[PDB]
Amino acid sequence: YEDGKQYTTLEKPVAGAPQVLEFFSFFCPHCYQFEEVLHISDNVKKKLPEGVKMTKYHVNFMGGDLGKDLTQAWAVAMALGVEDKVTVPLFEGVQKTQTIRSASDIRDVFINAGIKGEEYDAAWNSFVVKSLVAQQEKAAADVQLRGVPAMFVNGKYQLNPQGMDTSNMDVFVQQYADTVKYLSEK
Numbered sequence: 671y672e673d674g675k676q677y678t679t680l681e682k683p684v685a686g687a688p689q690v691l692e693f694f695s696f697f698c699p700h701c702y703q704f705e706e707v708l709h710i711s712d713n714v715k716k717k718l719p720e721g722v723k724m725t726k727y728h729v730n731f732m733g734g735d736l737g738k739d740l741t742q743a744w745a746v747a748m749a750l751g752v753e754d755k756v757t758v759p760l761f762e763g764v765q766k767t768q769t770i771r772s773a774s775d776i777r778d779v780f781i782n783a784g785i786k787g788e789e790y791d792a793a794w795n796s797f798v799v800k801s802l803v804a805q806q807e808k809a810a811a812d813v814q815l816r817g818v819p820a821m822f823v824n825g826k827y828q829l830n831p832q833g834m835d836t837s838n839m840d841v842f843v844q845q846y847a848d849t850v851k852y853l854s855e856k
């Protein structure tokens with residue numbers, strides 16, 4: 671492990687950042703791999719002590735006009751606690767079936783997942799969700815985020831997957847998770 675190889679150190683650390691902070695977009699192809707194919711967050715969580723706070727935020731800067739809608743939809747998922755019900759259908763709707771083309775199509779995913787229409791609409795329009803949208807945007811600004819996927823540890827270190835072994839996916843996931851473990855103990 672060397673700064674600049676498996677990870678980089680932030681010039682201005684982020685106080686108050688969670689222990690593990692992930693950024694993603696439902697438009698981001700590597701993010702689809704990280705979620706559906708590799709299950710990176712799950713395998714990272716398995717290698718950390720129990721109780722460690724992992725936070726995951728959506729970013730606006732992919733998908734054109736639909737990118738902000740997805741960040742707001744993710745805020746709704748966070749406010750309602752339904753992330754594990756909508757993550758897969760949102761990824762598949764955007765990237766696999768390409769059936770998500772509008773805010774209404776996003777809402778359909780939540781309706782199909784069992785979220786009542788009135789509660790989705792109330793959350794979508796709530797100031798709590800407006801604040802969650804702002805929080806996601808501020809977090810990305812705090813790290814001058816330029817691309818996704820991205821993971822930050824203790825507000826101080828950024829993961830660098832470009833330097834990891836991609837010839838074997840299990841080796842990649844274990845290298846990624848071990849690096850997060852190393853950084854979290856730093």
Ligand SMILES: O=C(O)c1cc[nH]c1
Binds near residue numbers: 732
């Ligand atoms: O797709 C884009 O580049 C984008 C969306 C919101 N801001 C930038």
Ligand SMILES: O=C(O)c1cc[nH]c1
Binds near residue numbers: 685687810812
């Ligand atoms: O950028 C911040 O300050 C932050 C990120 C997650 N919670 C707080």
Ligand SMILES: O=C(O)c1cc[nH]c1
Binds near residue numbers: 837
């Ligand atoms: O995310 C993938 O598909 C992957 C990771 C290592 N090699 C391929």
